[PDB]
Amino acid sequence: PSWPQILGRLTDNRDLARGQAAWAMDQIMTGNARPAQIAAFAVAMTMKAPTADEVGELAGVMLSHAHPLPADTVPDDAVDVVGTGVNTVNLSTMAAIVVAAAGVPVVKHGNRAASSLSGGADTLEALGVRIDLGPDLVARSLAEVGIGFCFAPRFHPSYRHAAAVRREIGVPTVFNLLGPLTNPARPRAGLIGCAFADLAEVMAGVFAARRSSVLVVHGDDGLDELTTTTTSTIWRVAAGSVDKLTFDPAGFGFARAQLDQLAGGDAQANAAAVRAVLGGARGPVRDAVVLNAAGAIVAHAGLSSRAEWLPAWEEGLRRASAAIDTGAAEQLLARWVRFGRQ
């Protein structure tokens, strides 16, 4: 294999041969790829339209270079809640806290962002959470708080050349999919949002080849989370298969919201919204947080429970609303801040 061979196949709009994506990713992860090569590959893979097999190789090779959490410190039923990217870091941050407050272990994965729009880590820091912890400490956090956060650069140091290139070019590429696919705690369940229906289906394919119970979701308004402004598409993944469906939260009594109402802002704006919602403020933002938290709980249930789709959603919505209303979510955040200060 070589760059001219792989790049040529992509620019010819052809799927790669098995092993080629992995070769490219390993070159990237080992410092052997020139920045021009990295960028050409990222762009060509994006414009060709990546397959699940290709993205599975990229993520898999990336994971092989990552630091893991210590042996047996991640509960078998840990979940992630995240979107691939305007962003909904506000929503996924709140949902994660609500989910952990409902009693489900959560482990997230993220970085500080250059943008005025908050990355995952930025909003959490604004809330007083300590985001850059080593594997042993992330593990303690999980055991004692029921939530943990893996700071991407610490857990994926060998991804530094790819990350640099991605910032240099700015444009979204297939590499934007790797974050939720490379959570170093390797949780087996989750709610994973994607802004593009076609890439969502590709990610669901990747999760299907893993031992996973996941809802990959796409708002039909383009949101990378379950939306309340219209329907969403859900790729339900369990036991190596995928069940794709149209989902409508009006069936659970959610009023229709407007897109402008749900969008995240900078870290400080987000932190303010988090305090209002966890303190009980009603509105479109709470509704979307509850909806996505419930979705993550439904995914979690798929790991063990044999509860069917509809009663799982009903219980998921009950648990998520209750985690907010009883102050459990506000208390968990405070406990999370305490853990860091100590």
Question: For residues 295 and 298, what is the distance between their CA atoms, to the nearest angstrom?
Answer: 5
Decide if residue 84 touches ligand 644 (CB under 6 A): yes
Q: Is residue 68 a contact partner of residue 107, using CB atoms and an 8 Å limit?
A: no
Residue 163 interface partner, choices ligand 644, a second copy, none, CB cut-off 5-8 Å depending on type: ligand 644
Residue 113 assigned to a binding site:
yes
Q: Is residue 184 a contact partner of residue 69, using CB atoms and an 8 Å limit?
A: yes
Considering beta carbons, is residue 161 or 319 the nearer one to ligand 644? 161
User: Least distance in Å: CB of 196 to a second copy?
Assistant: 11
Applying CB under 8 A, which of residues 16, 21, 25, 38 lies at the interface with a second copy? Answer: 38
Strand 147-151 and strand 106-110: pairing? parallel
DSSP character at residue 250: G
User: Least distance in Å: CB of 29 to ligand 644?
Assistant: 10
In the complex, which residue's CB is closest to ligand 644?
A: 179
Decide if residue 2 touches a second copy (CB under 8 A): yes
**Stretch touching a second copy by CB under 8 A, among 7-15, 236-244, 282-290, 334-342:** 7-15
From the centroid of its chain, how far is CA 259? 20
Residue 83 assigned to a binding site:
yes
Residue 156 assigned to a binding site:
no
Q: Is residue 209 a contact partner of residue 52, using CB atoms and an 8 Å limit?
A: yes
Q: Is residue 300 a contact partner of residue 215, using CB atoms and an 8 Å limit?
A: no
What residues numbered 169-228 form the site for ligand 644, per CB under 6 A? 176, 179
Decide if residue 153 touches ligand 644 (CB under 6 A): yes
Find tokens 């390797």 and name the residue. Answer: 186
Q: Is residue 249 a contact partner of residue 228, using CB atoms and an 8 Å limit?
A: yes
Decide if residue 63 touches ligand 644 (CB under 6 A): no
Give backbone dihedrals phi and psi of 143, rounded to 5 degrees, phi first.
-70, -35
Question: For residues 80 and 180, what is the distance between their CA atoms, to the nearest angstrom?
Answer: 8
**Stretch touching a second copy by CB under 8 A, among 167-175, 245-253, 276-284, 303-311:** 167-175
Which residues lie near ligand 644 (CB under 6 A)? Answer: 82, 84, 109-111, 118, 152-153, 156-157, 159-160, 163, 166, 176, 179
Binding residues for anthranilate: 83, 111, 166
